[PDB]
Amino acid sequence: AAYHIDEEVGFALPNPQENLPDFYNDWMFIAKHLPDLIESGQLRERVEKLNMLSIDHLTDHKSQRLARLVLGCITMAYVWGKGHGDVRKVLPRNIAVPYCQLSAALELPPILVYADCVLANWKKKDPNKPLTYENMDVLFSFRDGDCSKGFFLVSLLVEIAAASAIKVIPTVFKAMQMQERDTLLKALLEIASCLEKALQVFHQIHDHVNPKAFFSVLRIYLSGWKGNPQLSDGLVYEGFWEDPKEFAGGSAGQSSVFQCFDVLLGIQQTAGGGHAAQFLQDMRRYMPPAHRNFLCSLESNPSVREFVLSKGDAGLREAYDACVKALVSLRSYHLQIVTKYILIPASQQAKGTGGTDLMNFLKTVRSTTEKSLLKE
Ligand code: HEM
Ligand SMILES: N[C@@H](CC(=O)c1ccccc1NC=O)C(=O)O
Numbered sequence: 001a002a003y004h005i006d007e008e009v010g011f012a013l014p015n016p017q018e019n020l021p022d023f024y025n026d027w028m029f030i031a032k033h034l035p036d037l038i039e040s041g042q043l044r045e046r047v048e049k050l051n052m053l054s055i056d057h058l059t060d061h062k063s064q065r066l067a068r069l070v071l072g073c074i075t076m077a078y079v080w081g082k083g084h085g086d087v088r089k090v091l092p093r094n095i096a097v098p099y100c101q102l103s104a105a106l107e108l109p110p111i112l113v114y115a116d117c118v119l120a121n122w123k124k125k126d127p128n129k130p131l132t133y134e135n136m137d138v139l140f141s142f143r144d145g146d147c148s149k150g151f152f153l154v155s156l157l158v159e160i161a162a163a164s165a166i167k168v169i170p171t172v173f174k175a176m177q178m179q180e181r182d183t184l185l186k187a188l189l190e191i192a193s194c195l196e197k198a199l200q201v202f203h204q205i206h207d208h209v210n211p212k213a214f215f216s217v218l219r220i221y222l223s224g225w226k227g228n229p230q231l232s233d234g235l236v237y238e239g240f241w242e243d244p245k246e247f248a249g250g251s252a253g254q255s256s257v258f259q260c261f262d263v264l265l266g267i268q269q270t271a272g273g274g275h276a277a278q279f280l281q282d283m284r285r286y287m288p289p290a291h292r293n294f295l296c297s298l299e300s301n302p303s304v305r306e307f308v309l310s311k312g313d314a315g316l317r318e319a320y321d322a323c324v325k326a327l328v329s330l331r332s333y334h335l336q337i338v339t340k341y342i343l344i345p346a347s348q349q350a351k352g353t354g355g356t357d358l359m360n361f362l363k364t365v366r367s368t369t370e371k372s373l374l375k376e
Contacts, residue, residue, distance in 0.1 A: 003297070004290035009131070010163025011256050011291055012156060013120045017062040018139060024057070024067065026050055031070040034077050035144045044088065047078050052094040055102045064106055065120045071099040072112030072250075073140045076221045079235060083143075083220035087230050093239030100240040107289035110237060111224055111247040114254035115288045117148075118155045131160055133204060142221040150208025151218055154201070155252050161201040162257040165194035169264060169298075176307050184307075185319045192322035195261065199329050205337060215345035224249030253279075254286045256295065261327055263298040265320070266305030267372045269365055276364045309374065317374045324373050331366040338362060 006014040020028050030037065030046055037043040058064045074095060079088050091099075096110075103110040121139050129135040133153055141148040168187050175184035225231035226246040234246035259280060262269050270280045284292055308316040343355055352358025 002290075003294035004288065005166060005294065006163065007167045008163060009160050010166050011115075011119060011288075012122075012159045012163070013062065013065055013115075016120045016122060016139075017060075017066045018123055020063060020066055020070065021057050021059075024053060024070070027053065027067070027070045027074065031073045031140055034073060034140070034142050038077055038082055038143060041082070043077050044081065047074060047095060048092055050092070050094045053098055055098045055105075058102065064102055065116075067102060068099075068106060068108065069112075069116045069120050069140060071095060071102065072116045073142070075099065075110075076112050077142060079225070079231075080220055080223070083217065085230070089231060089244070090236040090238050096237040097239045100237050107292075109247045109286060112222065112250040113286045114155075114250055114252060115286075117222070117250060118152050118252070118255075119159065119288075121152055122156055131157070133157060133208065143217050145210075145213055146217040146221070147209045147213040148218055150205070151214060154205050154208055155255075157204065158198055158201050159255065159257060161194065161198040162260075165191045165198070166257075166260060168194070169260075172264070172304060173301055176302060176304070181311070181313070181316070185315050188304075188316070188319035188323055191261070192319065192326045195323065195326035195330065198257075199326070199333055202330070202333055202337070206340075209341065211341045211345050214341045219342070222250045248282065248286060250286075254283050256287050256291045258327070258330070259284070259295055260298070261323065262369075263295055264304060265324055265327070265372060266303045267324070267327070267369055269368055274364075276361055276368075279361065280365075305372070314376075317376060321373050321375070324369065328366060328369050331362065331369060335359070335362050335366065 006012065008014065027050075030043070030050075034043065037046060055064075055067070058067050075091060078091065078095070081087065100110045108115070117140070123137055123139060124131070125135045125137060136153055136156075138149050138152045168191050172184060172187045172191070174180075175187055224247050225235045225244075226248045228249075231244075234244035236244045259269070261267075270277045270284075284295060287295075304320065308320040338358065342358065343352070346352075347354075352360075
């Protein structure tokens with residue numbers, strides 16, 4: 001509510017803006033034509049010829065969100081080029097400066113993130129039909145046959161499915177705060193079901209995303225410069241920071257959906273000095289700031305886990321366990337997705353060298369989720 005959470009679409013930006021003020025057309029034209037401009041070897045040339053446009057004409061939140069998307073898309077294309085190794089280590093001043101300033105205003109790092117290319121990058125084809133794949137579209141793509149429509153929309157359609165679980169979270173805390181045993185139990189059962197529906201939405205990834213396309217084309221435009229050998233020291237945001245800075249690649253791992261129900265269930269992923277807790281805390285740096293606050297204010301609330309154990313209630317424990325189980329399913333299925341779209345295409349013809357780091361990260365987080373089951 002005050003954490004920029006929509007009841008219909010959750011962490012997704014409701015009805016995002018598609019057009020920037022005519023003042024920014026030179027940006028909009030480049031971003032809308034990245035498939036051709038990258039194809040024809042012209043993208044870097046047009047970026048380097050841009051003037052510097054003041055960000056003072058981005059008048060409202062949704063317009064700044066759209067412009068972060070345009071500039072984020074232009075940056076990725078510029079840095080990565082055609083994605084065959086010939087990279088760019090200096091983002092020109094005429095983009096670097098307005099982008100860094102706009103990102104500082106929005107409290108996001110100056111790199112493309114999930115909130116840009118999934119949460120803000122969509123529209124209904126017909127605004128009176130409902131939110132289904134057939135009635136939506138993304139607003140930007142990088143290459144012909146990069147399956148960005150399928151990967152962004154389905155990631156987004158999962159976000160929407162999670163929203164029906166998220167709009168219950170107040171009812172859970174109100175239930176506790178008033179000792180409403182049955183209200184609490186139905187809320188948790190409802191959350192578990194919504195999360196089970198989310199898992200079903202996740203299945204549509206196979207209909208709309210080709211593994212070779214993802215691993216070989218879309219994964220390139222989504223890669224950052226933070227522990228990247230190709231940009232060992234980060235990117236120079238010319239005219240804004242004297243020294244190159246390092247920013248993580250925009251993944252789905254930036255989604256607030258898994259952490260939101262980790263925090264709500266008292267599952268302590270982001271607890272410790274371990275490497276998995278770190279990456280999860282890091283990824284919060286890459287989320288919209290209203291959602292960064294939502295997660296922290298959830299950790300500050302009285303624990304669901306502690307209350308269900310305090311009551312000697314098989315009922316609440318089953319329902320709380322139903323949610324914990326749903327989370328384990330999502331991560332299990334999510335591990336099966338990672339194997340299809342990254343693990344297998346890697347071992348042909350690129351983190352987790354041989355599999356080691358990627359898989360063991362996601363396995364670790366799933367295991368922490370497993371051990372949280374109350375059972376008894
Ligand atoms: C469909 C193809 C997908 C692929 C190939 C993929 C890949 C990955 C990768 C590589 C990571 C590790 C972080 C990194 O290395 O940057 C990760 C973690 C993660 N992913 Fe995805 N992802 C996909 C879809 C999704 C979707 C649809 C969601 C949620 C709506 C999601 C949510 C997450 C989360 C939350 C993490 C962090 C681990 C955790 O918190 O449990 N992913 N994924
Ligand atoms: N006026 C700036 C130059 C600059 O940043 C710039 C680059 C391209 C097009 C216009 C520019 N001037 C003001 O935004 C200066 O004094 O360095």
